[PDB]
Amino acid sequence: FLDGIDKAQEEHEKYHSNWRAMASDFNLPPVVAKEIVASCDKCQCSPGIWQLNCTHLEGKVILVAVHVASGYIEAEVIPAETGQETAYFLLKLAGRWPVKTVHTNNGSNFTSTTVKAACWWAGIKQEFGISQGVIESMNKELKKIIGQVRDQAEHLKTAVQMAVFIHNFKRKGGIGGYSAGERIVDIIATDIQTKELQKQITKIQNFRVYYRKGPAKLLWKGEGAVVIQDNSDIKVVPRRKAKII
Amino acid sequence: FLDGIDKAQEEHEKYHSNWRAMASDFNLPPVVAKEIVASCDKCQVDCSPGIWQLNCTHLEGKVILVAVHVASGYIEAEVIPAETGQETAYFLLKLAGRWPVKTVHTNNGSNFTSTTVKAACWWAGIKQEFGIPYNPQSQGVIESMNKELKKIIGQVRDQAEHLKTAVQMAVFIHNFKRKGGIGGYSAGERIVDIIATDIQTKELQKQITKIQNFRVYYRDSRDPVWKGPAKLLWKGEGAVVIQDNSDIKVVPRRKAKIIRDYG
Amino acid sequence: GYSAGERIVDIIATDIQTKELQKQITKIQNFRVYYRDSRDPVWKGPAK
Amino acid sequence: FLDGIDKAQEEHEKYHSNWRAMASDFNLPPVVAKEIVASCDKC
Ligand SMILES: [Zn+2]
Numbered sequence: 001f002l003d004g005i006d007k008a009q010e011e012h013e014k015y016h017s018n019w020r021a022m023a024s025d026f027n028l029p030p031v032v033a034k035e036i037v038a039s040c041d042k043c044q045c046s047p048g049i050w051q052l053n054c055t056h057l058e059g060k061v062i063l064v065a066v067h068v069a070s071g072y073i074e075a076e077v078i079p080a081e082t083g084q085e086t087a088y089f090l091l092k093l094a095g096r097w098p099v100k101t102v103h104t105n106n107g108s109n110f111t112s113t114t115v116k117a118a119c120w121w122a123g124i125k126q127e128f129g130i131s132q133g134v135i136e137s138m139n140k141e142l143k144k145i146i147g148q149v150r151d152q153a154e155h156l157k158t159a160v161q162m163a164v165f166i167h168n169f170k171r172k173g174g175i176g177g178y179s180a181g182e183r184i185v186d187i188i189a190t191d192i193q194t195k196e197l198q199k200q201i202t203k204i205q206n207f208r209v210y211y212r213k214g215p216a217k218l219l220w221k222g223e224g225a226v227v228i229q230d231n232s233d234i235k236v237v238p239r240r241k242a243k244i245i
Numbered sequence: 246f247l248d249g250i251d252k253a254q255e256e257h258e259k260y261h262s263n264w265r266a267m268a269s270d271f272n273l274p275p276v277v278a279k280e281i282v283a284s285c286d287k288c289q290v291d292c293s294p295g296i297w298q299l300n301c302t303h304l305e306g307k308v309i310l311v312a313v314h315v316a317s318g319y320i321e322a323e324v325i326p327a328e329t330g331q332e333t334a335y336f337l338l339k340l341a342g343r344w345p346v347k348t349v350h351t352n353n354g355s356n357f358t359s360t361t362v363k364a365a366c367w368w369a370g371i372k373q374e375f376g377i378p379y380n381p382q383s384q385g386v387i388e389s390m391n392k393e394l395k396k397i398i399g400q401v402r403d404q405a406e407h408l409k410t411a412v413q414m415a416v417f418i419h420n421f422k423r424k425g426g427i428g429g430y431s432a433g434e435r436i437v438d439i440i441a442t443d444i445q446t447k448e449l450q451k452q453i454t455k456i457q458n459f460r461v462y463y464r465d466s467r468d469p470v471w472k473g474p475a476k477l478l479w480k481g482e483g484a485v486v487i488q489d490n491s492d493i494k495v496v497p498r499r500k501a502k503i504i505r506d507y508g
Numbered sequence: 509g510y511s512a513g514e515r516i517v518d519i520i521a522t523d524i525q526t527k528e529l530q531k532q533i534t535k536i537q538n539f540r541v542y543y544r545d546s547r548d549p550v551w552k553g554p555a556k
Numbered sequence: 557f558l559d560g561i562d563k564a565q566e567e568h569e570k571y572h573s574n575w576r577a578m579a580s581d582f583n584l585p586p587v588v589a590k591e592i593v594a595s596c597d598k599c
């Protein structure tokens with residue numbers, strides 16, 4: 001609130017962020033943020049799962065990719081529709097982010113020789129046929145922000161880049177008021193720490209538990225419950241009828 | 246046998262190691278190791294790893310401070326020029342910096358009860374136990390290590406030009422190449438294995454608390470909406486075991502999101 | 509080592525079992541199914 | 557046995573003696589004689 005109204009206005013005239021965005025960033029009550037938004041005449045699964053699609057806008061083809069788990073967005077306008085640039089974009093996004101599976105349709109560009117070669121070289125699994133509602137909602141939201149910033153757009157590429165920047169950073173999302181970048185950072189960090197701790201155990205803790213059958217390995221004992229894994233199957237049993245050795 | 250005899254006799258005239266070490270390291274028959282040992286004219290308790298014993302001896306007119314690990318027999322000896330509590334505190338802080346010791350056994354010597362020793366043990370949080378040790382086994386190990394170090398120092402004094410160098414060579418040969426009478430392994434290997442296998446409960450408890458601190462959002466097979474912040478128990482390749490209001494649930498990895506809500 | 513009666517009764521029992529198996533077959537009529545080969549991303553069909 | 561392995565090797569490279577002979581004439585244990593015989597590409 002310490003001179004925060006002026007900077008909130010100067011950033012709303014810059015990016016036109018959502019009310020919650022400048023409410024949380026500059027520490028202002030939601031009422032004044034909503035008033036600032038209204039005063040503007042232009043305003044009123046798994047980490048490796050990524051979805052790529054093609055869209056058409058004013059005689060321009062745009063390849064747009066989106067992380068399903070965190071909602072992060074990337075886009076690039078391809079001048080001449082060919083599979084080689086699709087493969088280039090795929091390898092660039094692989095070099096910028098770890099992707100293990102891509103969901104696309106049976107399009108020629110998505111199944112092109114260059115794209116298939118690049119995805120097989122990078123070891124990325126392919127799945128054809130597609131969730132879609134979230135992709136469409138993100139697409140129309142990015143169209144809305146593109147229309148918002150088109151007044152200052154000298155060229156299409158700069159406008160698309162600025163729209164991506166304001167979507168990923170200059171707008172807070174849903175649960176917890178976290179943007180797409182914050183969500184993807186959180187999920188990646190949690191996955192890394194959980195896998196590290198999982199690799200820490202089974203090097204120290206190794207116990208054999210008999211229930212009712214076989215020499216199952218102990219997984220979690222407590223709260224009057226024993227969860228174990230055996231033959232690639234996880235079973236949960238009460239504390240009774242279970243001996244830990 | 247692939248020219249191992251020459252390198253073995255070189256490292257035996259330089260080290261005078263045990264024949265088991267020669268057999269294991271250089272892949273030679275035990276007869277060769279035994280004859281190499283014979284050719285040299287100079288040669289013929291499971292507890293908490295926080296227990297160490299410190300002692301002082303007068304050898305060749307000089308004062309030697311030796312610290313020994315009870316659980317493995319690892320030794321560390323230094324030559325102190327002038328007997329003062331400051332140097333004893335120096336050795337204590339050195340061994341505290343290099344090892345996570347928690348209990349020291351010493352006698353009632355003047356330098357053992359120095360103010361510097363008390364300050365160091367209070368600052369490092371190391372328990373102090375003066376008087377006669379309660380375990381005769383530790384005293385026997387002390388005597389065996391003392392006689393062995395005296396023998397090896399007498400053997401190696403000709404090579405070195407100073408007493409400190411001879412002591413360091415003796416501790417080096419004892420710790421790394423010498424094999425103990427139980428298991429036939431080096432003292433350094435034993436102590437490092439004990440240290441590695443000792444730090445398990447603290448890491449287990451901290452990992453359990455951390456994994457319980459996580460938050461999980463999951464959906465059922467036929468439920469399109471996400472559930473609340475279920476506590477996390479265990480993560481797998483394709484299944485995750487979680488708690489949700491004293492209920493244990495196994496969820497496929499496809500329908501599970503793992504997050505740490507910082508806010 | 510069994511006479512004509514055993515042969516004919518076994519044949520009729522086998523015929524009854526095959527009739528039951530064919531009834532199990534007729535439990536499935538159209539049941540269109542799609543399949544994939546060697547974990548390929550492409551879905552193949554139609555199949556009967 | 558004192559450096560007799562080299563003498564056994566340099567005699568076996570020329571005559572290719574049996575393990576018993578090379579053990580007897582140079583005071584070698586039977587295991588060393590057997591491994592020397594085995595190491596020869598002709599025997
Ligand atoms: Zn606005």
Ligand SMILES: [Zn+2]
Nearest residue numbers: 261285287288
């Ligand atoms: Zn020796």
Ligand SMILES: [Zn+2]
Nearest residue numbers: 572596598599
């Ligand atoms: Zn030969």
